[PDB]
Design a binder for this molecule. Structure first.
Ligand SMILES: Nc1ncnc2c1ncn2[C@@H]1O[C@H](COP(=O)(O)OP(=O)(O)O)[C@@H](O)[C@H]1O
Ligand SMILES: Nc1ncnc2c1ncn2[C@@H]1O[C@H](COP(=O)(O)OP(=O)(O)O)[C@@H](O)[C@H]1O
Ligand SMILES: CCCCCNC(=O)CCNC(=O)[C@H](O)C(C)(C)CO
Ligand SMILES: CCCCCNC(=O)CCNC(=O)[C@H](O)C(C)(C)CO
Lengths: 309, 309
């Protein structure tokens, strides 16, 4: 049956890809690989360049509408950033997807200044999660300072000249105590996190009545089947453990003393008991709120793009 | 502090009507007076013509974008209506606002076909409300078949060739037995109802995960102080009562049989015990989710307009 999404067929996707010259210079190819050494350049050419080009159509149409309204309404021409959000399971590739889209979108002269903010920064710090008995519930709704996350995007959509977000580090598994990131009226702000499509219903312990989505222009849910997500999560955990072999400041220091087999069992249980329950209860149900659903397969290659009609 | 809204006072909003020349036609005037005899044409020319022109800019921007996307999407796809929703208290003037905008938006050659659907039709019938003890809660979240309403707008946004809504009559105070209304791909659909800005959080008894708002391009919340809403509610009730003098099939015949004074007492209790409580608990908290908040003062005169930046 018909749904609110069109699924791109290969001729529509190819025409999008081929609509512009947008293959990259050598230096740009180098910086892309620096985002993630496992990123395929074939994916960049077949998937991420066209997806960034698709977004440009939306962003550009919005700038023109803004010019038309400022003339009509007689307003002072104030800059409002276009906000793109990126949702999905832990370990689906939200960060990589977001960093790739930041780099590619910045190539278009109409919107060169692209910022990226993760919702991880808005987690309550470990001290606080401890106080509340939620250290096993990191990434669940009760673990976020949701009111502050909404205020951040709300302030941006208010035309504030600067806004400040707290910052989180996966390497030390916590919010950086004085590591705040200040942004100033970018053309585009990408908001990356598992909870960007969540709403007041997900926070009954402390309700809010205006949602992140109410301040977001375009949202992407990055989707993938459970088994792939689990293996991606375990592999990434093993990578951090490896890092910890030589870096004493890694939070994975003690995991690097275990056998690999035991480390795998731990990661497996973290996935099963925390991130997978979080997916099923809180993340996956938000999926049909997205502007666009990008589905991933083997080796992270995107096999389906659905866009709201 | 700056907010997410451009704020216009009446002087500033009315000043828009010259910014782009516009005057009502002769046929339009007759249509308008047939919509509401108490509706001022000056109020139409000063407030609603500029509002309609605002909306045309949004709608036209969308149509232009759609044309551009069609370059790679192709033209085979189904026509999707632009959906405008109208929220606010019982008796604020949603229906009047909707019907006026339907009349005025028909002007433009870009979008001549304009349908109007009220969420009233998606109320559970009185028999069902009686089963569930909800008869004193008509208009509260539990009194709606919300799943059916989300599906209706979802279907429209899926490109169905036709979609069908149930219809309600204030005259018989119930859903009409076999009175369903079918719409066929209009250019604009106006959805009018107190609950159009509500979400799953408002339906904890039977939650939904994609909201009405997720299928709405542009939302208006019509706002006014409680004391005016009360007066407008009571006056309307007395007008329904008069209509029932010569109409014993009106549910208001029950009140036509009573003295005016006692009828006013009843109407006032219904306001205070049902609609005012609904406003405070369920309607007003959704106001900040609107694209535009239009505020009214004495005699329905608009004194402030707020539009999302
Ligand atoms: N497009 C991709 N190509 C190859 N590997 C990827 C891709 N996206 C993500 N990954 C890998 O999958 C894992 C999860 O990605 P990450 O961006 O950290 O997910 P998230 O931010 O959603 O938690 C990481 O190990 C990352 O290197
Ligand atoms: N713009 C207006 N000018 C004059 N009277 C109005 C206006 N809007 C609404 N009314 C009156 O106020 C009452 C409530 O309006 P209605 O459109 O029935 O409200 P709702 O649909 O919100 O319940 C009605 O008696 C209506 O005639
Ligand atoms: C050094 C400790 C390793 C355990 C990591 N915990 C988990 O994967 C379970 C909690 N989830 C997370 O830590 C997720 O990465 C987060 C909620 C921050 C979303 O990006
Ligand atoms: C006895 C016949 C008139 C009773 C009117 N009821 C009320 O005003 C309370 C219930 N609310 C309503 O009937 C509202 O009009 C509705 C919820 C349908 C929103 O358009």
């Amino acid at each position: 049956l018909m749904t609110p999404y069109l699924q791109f067929n290969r001729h529509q996707w190819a025409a999008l890809r081929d609509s512009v010259p947008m293959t990259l210079t050598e230096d740009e190819i180098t910086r892309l690989k620096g985002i993630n050494e496992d990123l395929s350049l074939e994916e960049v050419a077949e998937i991420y360049l066209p997806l960034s080009r698709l977004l440009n159509f939306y962003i550009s149409s919005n700038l023109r509408r803004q010019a038309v309204l400022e003339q009509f309404l007689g307003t002072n021409g104030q800059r409002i950033p276009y906000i793109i959000s990126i949702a999905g399971s832990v370990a689906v590739g939200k960060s990589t997807t977001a960093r790739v889209l930041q780099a590619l979108l910045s190539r278009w002269p109409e919107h060169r200044h692209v910022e990226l903010i993760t919702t991880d920064g808005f987690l309550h710090p470990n001290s606080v999660l401890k106080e509340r008995g939620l250290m096993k519930k990191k990434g669940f709704p009760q673990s976020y300072d949701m009111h502050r996350l909404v205020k951040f995007v709300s302030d941006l959509k208010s035309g504030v000249p600067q806004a400040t977000a707290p910052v989180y580090s996966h390497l030390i598994y916590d919010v950086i105590p004085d590591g705040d990131k200040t942004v100033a009226q970018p053309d585009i702000l990408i908001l990356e996190g598992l909870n960007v499509l969540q709403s007041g219903m997900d926070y009954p312990h402390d309700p809010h009545h205006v949602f992140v989505s109410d301040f977001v222009d375009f949202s992407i849910y990055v989707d993938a089947p459970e088994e792939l997500l689990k293996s991606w999560y375990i592999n990434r955990f093993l990578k951090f453990r490896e890092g910890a072999f030589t870096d004493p400041d890694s939070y994975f220091h003690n995991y690097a003393k275990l056998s690999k087999e035991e480390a795998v069992d731990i990661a497996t249980s973290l996935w099963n008991e925390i991130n997978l329950m979080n997916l099923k209860e809180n993340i996956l149900p938000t999926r049909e709120r997205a502007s666009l659903i990008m589905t991933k397969s083997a080796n992270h290659s995107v096999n389906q793009v659905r866009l709201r009609k």
